[PDB]
Amino acid sequence: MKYMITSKGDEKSDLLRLNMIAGFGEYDMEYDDVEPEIVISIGGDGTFLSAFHQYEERLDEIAFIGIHTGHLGFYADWRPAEADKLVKLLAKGEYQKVSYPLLKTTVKYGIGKKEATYLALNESTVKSSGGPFVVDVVINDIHFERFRGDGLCMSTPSGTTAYNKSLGGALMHPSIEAMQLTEMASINNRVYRTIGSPLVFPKHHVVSLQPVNDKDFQISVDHLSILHRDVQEIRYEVSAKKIHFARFRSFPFWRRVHDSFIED
Amino acid sequence: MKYMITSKGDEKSDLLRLNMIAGFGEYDMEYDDVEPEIVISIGGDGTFLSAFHQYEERLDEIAFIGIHTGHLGFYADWRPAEADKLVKLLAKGEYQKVSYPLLKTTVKYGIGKKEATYLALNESTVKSSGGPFVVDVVINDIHFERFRGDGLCMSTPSGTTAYNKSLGGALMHPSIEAMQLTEMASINNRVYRTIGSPLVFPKHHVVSLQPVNDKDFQISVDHLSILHRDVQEIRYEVSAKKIHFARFRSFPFWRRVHDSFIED
Amino acid sequence: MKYMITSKGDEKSDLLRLNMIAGFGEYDMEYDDVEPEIVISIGGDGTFLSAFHQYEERLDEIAFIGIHTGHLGFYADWRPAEADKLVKLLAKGEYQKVSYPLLKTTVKYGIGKKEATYLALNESTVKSSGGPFVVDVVINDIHFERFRGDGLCMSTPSGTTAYNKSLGGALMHPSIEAMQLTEMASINNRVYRTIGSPLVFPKHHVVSLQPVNDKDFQISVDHLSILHRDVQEIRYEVSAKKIHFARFRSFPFWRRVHDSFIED
Amino acid sequence: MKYMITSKGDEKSDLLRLNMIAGFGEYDMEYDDVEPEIVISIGGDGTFLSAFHQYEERLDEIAFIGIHTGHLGFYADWRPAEADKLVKLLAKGEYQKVSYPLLKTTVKYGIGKKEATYLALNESTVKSSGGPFVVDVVINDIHFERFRGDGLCMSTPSGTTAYNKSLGGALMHPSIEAMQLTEMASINNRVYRTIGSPLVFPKHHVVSLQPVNDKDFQISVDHLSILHRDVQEIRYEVSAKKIHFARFRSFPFWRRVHDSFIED
Ligand SMILES: NCCNC(=O)NC[C@H]1O[C@@H](n2c(C#CCN(CC(=O)O)C[C@H]3O[C@@H](n4cnc5c(N)ncnc54)[C@H](O)[C@@H]3O)nc3c(N)ncnc32)[C@H](O)[C@@H]1O
Ligand SMILES: NCCNC(=O)NC[C@H]1O[C@@H](n2c(C#CCN(CC(=O)O)C[C@H]3O[C@@H](n4cnc5c(N)ncnc54)[C@H](O)[C@@H]3O)nc3c(N)ncnc32)[C@H](O)[C@@H]1O
Ligand SMILES: NCCNC(=O)NC[C@H]1O[C@@H](n2c(C#CCN(CC(=O)O)C[C@H]3O[C@@H](n4cnc5c(N)ncnc54)[C@H](O)[C@@H]3O)nc3c(N)ncnc32)[C@H](O)[C@@H]1O
Ligand SMILES: NCCNC(=O)NC[C@H]1O[C@@H](n2c(C#CCN(CC(=O)O)C[C@H]3O[C@@H](n4cnc5c(N)ncnc54)[C@H](O)[C@@H]3O)nc3c(N)ncnc32)[C@H](O)[C@@H]1O
Chains near A, with 3+ CB pairs < 8 A? B, C
**Axis-axis angle for helices A11-24, A83-91 (nearest 10):** 30
Handedness of CA D237, D101, C181, C107 (dihedral sign): positive
How far from chain centre, in Å, is Cα B184? 18
Please report, as a single letter, which amino acid is at residue D252.
P
Specify the long-range contacts of residues B6-12, CB closer than 8 Å, at least 24 apart.
B6/B39, B6/B40, B6/B41, B6/B42, B6/B43, B6/B47, B6/B50, B6/B51, B6/B54, B7/B42, B7/B43, B7/B47, B8/B42, B8/B43, B8/B44, B8/B46, B8/B47, B8/B69, B9/B43, B10/B43, B10/B69, B12/B69, B12/B80
Nearest by CB to C252, from D140, D202, D261: name it.
Answer: D140
Produce one character per residue of B209-233: b if its CB has 16 or more CB atoms within 10 Å, e if not: bbbeeeeebbbbbbeeeeebeebbb
Measured over the CA atoms of residue A113, residue A116, residue A120 and residue A123, the dihedral's sign is: negative
C125 and C163 Cβ atoms separated by less than 8 Å: yes
Residues whose CB falls within 8 Å of the CB of residue C157, separated by 6 or more in sequence, listed in order:
C100, C101, C172, C173, C174, C175, C176, C177, C178, C180
Report d(CA A147, CA A109) in Å as an integer.
20
Helix H or strand E encompassing A76:
none
Q: Single out the residue of C68, C61, C5 nearest to residue C37, CA to CA.
A: C61
Reference A163, options A195, A129, A135, A124; nearest CA is A124
C55 lines ligand 1 (CB under 6 A): no
> What length does chain C have?
264
CA separation for the pair A89, D250 (Å, rounded) = 58
The two most distant CA atoms of chain A are separated, in Å, by 69
Task: Decide whether any atom of ligand 1 lies within 6 Å of the C46 Cβ.
Answer: yes
| Cα–Cα distance for residue pair D71/D55, rounded to 1 Å | 25
Strands C231-247 and C217-221: unpaired
DSSP state letter for C78: B
Q: How far apart are CA D199 and CA D181, in angstroms?
A: 5
In sequence order, which residues have a C-beta less than 8 Å from that of residue D234 and are 6 or more positions away?
A: D105, D106, D107, D108, D126, D135, D208, D209, D217, D219
Q: What technique was this entry resolved by?
A: X-ray
CA D121 → CA A181, A252, D43, distances in Å? 41, 44, 17
Cα D248 to Cα D44: distance, rounded to the nearest angstrom: 20
Instruction: Give start and end residues of each alpha helix (H) in C64-215.
Output: 83-91, 163-166
Please give the Cα distance from D131 to D214 (Å, whole number).
8
* Beta pairing, strands A38-43 & A224-228: unpaired
Report the distance separating Cα C121 and Cα C104, nearest Å: 9
Contact A254 B139 (CB under 8 A): yes
Element (H, E) at C254: helix C253-261
> What is the spatial distance between Cα D111 and Cα D230, in angstroms, rounded to a whole number?
8
* Number of neighbours of residue A174 by Cβ within 10 angstroms: 22
Phi, psi (deg, nearest 5) at residue A114: -55, 160
Nearest to A129, CA basis, from C66, D39, C98, C130: C130
Cβ-based neighbour number of residue A22 at 10 Å: 10
CB D259 within 8 A of CB D140: no
Phi, psi at C250, each rounded to 5°: -75, 135
HEC string of chain B equals CEEEEEECCCHHHHHHHHHHHHHHCCCCCEECCCCCCEEEEEECHHHHHHHHHHCCCCHHHCEEEEEECCCCCCCCCECHHHHHHHHHHHHCCCCEEEEEEEEEEEEEECCCCCEEEEEECCEEEEEECCCCEEEEEEECCEEEEEEEEEEEEEECCHHHHCHHHHCCCCEECCCCCEEEEEEEEECCCCCCCCCCCCEEEECCCCEEEEECCCCCEEEEECCEEEEECCEEEEEEEEEEEEEEEEECCCCCHHHHHHHHHCCC
List Cβ<8 Å contacts ≥24 apart for D161-167.
D161/D74, D161/D257, D161/D260, D161/D261, D162/D45, D162/D74, D162/D122, D162/D123, D163/B185, D163/D122, D163/D123, D163/D125, D164/D123, D164/D198, D165/B188, D165/C197, D166/B149, D166/B185, D166/B186, D166/B187, D166/B188, D167/B185, D167/D198
Exposure class string for B129-140: b at 16+ Cβ within 10 A, else e: eeeebbbebbbe
Q: How far apart are CA D75 and CA B139, in angstroms?
A: 36
Ligand 3: does its nearest atom lie under 6 Å from the Cβ of C214?
no
How many Å from the N-terminal Cα to the C-terminal Cα in chain B? 34
The number of residues in chain B equals 264
Q: Which residues of chain C from 170 to 229 reach within 8 Å of chain D, CB to CB?
A: 170-173, 175-176, 178, 180, 193-195, 197-202, 205
For residue B112, what are the contacts with CB-CB under 8 A and spacing of at least 6? none
Q: How far, in Å, CA of B121 to CA of B51, rounded?
A: 11
User: What does residue A60 show for φ and ψ, rounded to 5 degrees?
Assistant: -80, -10
Q: From the CB of residue C118, how many other CB atoms can be counted at a distance below 10 Å? A: 19
* Three-state secondary structure call for residue D20: helix
- D142–C200 C-beta distance less than 8 A: no
Closest CA to B168 of D42, C52, A169: A169
Asked if A39 and A59 count as a contact pair (C-beta separation under 8 A), the reply is: no
Resolution (A): 1.6
Q: From CA B241, how far away is CA B12, in angstroms rounded?
A: 33
CA atoms within 13 A on the CB side of B206: 11
Residue (of D140, D244, D256, D131) closest to D201 by Cα position: D140
Count Cβ atoms within 10 A of the Cβ of residue A99 and give its class: 0-12 exposed, 13-18 middle, 19 or more buried. Answer: middle
Those residues with Cβ within 8 angstroms of residue A13's Cβ, 6 or more apart along the chain or in another chain: A7, A42, A43, A47, A69
Instruction: From B247, B248, B260, select the one nearest B73 (Cα to Cα).
Output: B260
Could you give the CA distance from residue C149 to residue A12 in angstroms, rounded to a whole number? 27
User: CB burial class (10 A; 0-12, 13-18, 19+) of residue C135?
Assistant: buried
Q: What's phi and psi for B193, nearest 5 deg?
A: -140, 130
For D204, name the nearest residue in chain C, comparing CA atoms only. C175
Sign of CA dihedral C90, C96, C100, C102: positive
**Cross-chain residue pair B163–D149, CB shorter than 8 Å:** no
Which residues are CB-contacts of D159 (< 8 A; sequence separation ≥ 6)?
Answer: D103, D120, D121, D122, D123
User: How many residues appear in chain A?
Assistant: 264
Q: Specify whether the CB–CB gap between A67 and A204 falls below 8 A.
A: no
Contact in structure between D96 and D29 (CB atoms under 8 Å): no
D242, D61, D235: which is closest to D135 by C-alpha? D235
Alpha-carbon distance of D136 to D147, in angstroms, equals: 6
Residues whose CB falls within 8 Å of the CB of residue A11, separated by 6 or more in sequence, listed in order:
none
How many CB atoms sit inside 10 A of residue D50's CB? Answer: 16
**Residue B177 neighbours by CB under 8 Å, 6+ apart:** B101, B157, B202, B203, B238
CA–CA dist B78, B86 (Å, integer): 8
| Residue pair D146/D212 in contact by the 8 Å Cβ criterion | yes
Looking at ligand 2, which residue's alpha carbon is closest to its atom 18? D46
What is the torsion angle, in degrees rounded to the nearest 10, for the CA atoms of residue A158, residue A162, residue A168 and residue A171? 20
Instruction: Please report, to the nearest 10 degrees, the dihedral formed by the alpha carbons of residues D236, D238, D243, D245 taken in order.
Output: 130
Contacts of B252 in chain A (CB under 8 A): 140, 142
Q: Are A177 and B178 in contact (CB under 8 A)?
A: no
Distance CA C164, CA D17 (A): 47
The counts of H helices and E strands in chain A are: 5, 16
Active site residue C10: no
Q: Please, is A249 exposed, middle or buried when counting C-beta atoms within 10 Å of its C-beta (0-12, 13-18, 19+)?
A: exposed
In C, residues 126-165, which contact D (CB 8 Å cutoff)? 139-140, 142-145, 165
Can you tell me the distance from the alpha carbon of B145 to that of B195, in angstroms, rounded to the nearest whole number? 8
- Give buried/exposed letters for D62-74 (b at 16+ CB in 10 A, else e): bbbbbbbbbebbb
Gap between the Cα atoms of A224 and A231, Å rounded: 18
Q: Under a CB-based contact definition with an 8 Å cutoff, are residues A74 and C189 in contact? A: no
Element of type H or E holding D1? none
**Angstrom distances, CA of residue D215 to CA of A213, B249, D39, D183, D207:** 51, 44, 38, 19, 18
**N- to C-terminal Cα separation, chain C:** 34
DSSP state of C113: -
Cα–Cα dist D264/D253, whole Å: 14
Centroid of chain to Cα C208: 19
Residue from D67, D97, D69 nearest D85 by CA = D67
| Distance from C-alpha of B257 to C-alpha of B161, rounded to nearest angstrom | 8
Cα–Cα distance list, C129 to A134, A224, C126, C225 (Å): 22, 15, 9, 11
Distance CA C112, CA C135 (A): 21
Q: What is the 3-state secondary structure (H, E, C) of C191-228?
A: CCCCCCCCEEEECCCCEEEEECCCCCEEEEECCEEEEE
Would you call C215 exposed, middle or buried from its count of C-beta atoms within 10 A (0-12, 13-18, 19+)? middle
Which residues have CB under 8 Å from B151's CB, separation 6+?
B125, B126, B127, B128, B133, B184, B185
| Residue D234: φ, ψ to 5° | -120, 125
Q: What residue's CA is closest to ligand 3, atom 19?
A: A46
> In chain C, how many H helices and how many E strands?
5, 16
Distance, in Å, from the CA atom of D177 to the CA atom of D242, rounded to the nearest integer, reads 10
What is the Cα Rg of chain A in Å?
20
The angle formed by the CA atoms of residues B185, B189 and B193, to the nearest 5 degrees, is: 70
- The residue nearest atom 1 of ligand 3, judged by CA position, is C132
What letter does residue C34 receive in the DSSP assignment? S
**Which H or E run includes A173?**
none
B149: left (phi over 0), alpha (psi -120 to 50) or beta: left
Distance of alpha carbon B29 from alpha carbon B93, whole angstroms: 11
D-contacting residues in C 223-252 (Cβ below 8 Å): 252
| Strand residues in chain D grouped as ranges (E) | 2-7, 30-31, 38-43, 63-68, 96-109, 115-120, 123-128, 133-139, 142-155, 171-172, 178-186, 199-202, 207-211, 217-221, 224-228, 231-247
Nearest CA-CA partner of B212 in B146, B141, B113, B115: B146
Q: Do residues A31 and A4 lie in contact, with contact meaning Cβ atoms separated by under 8 Å?
A: yes
The active-site residue, picked from C14, C28, C45, C214, is C45
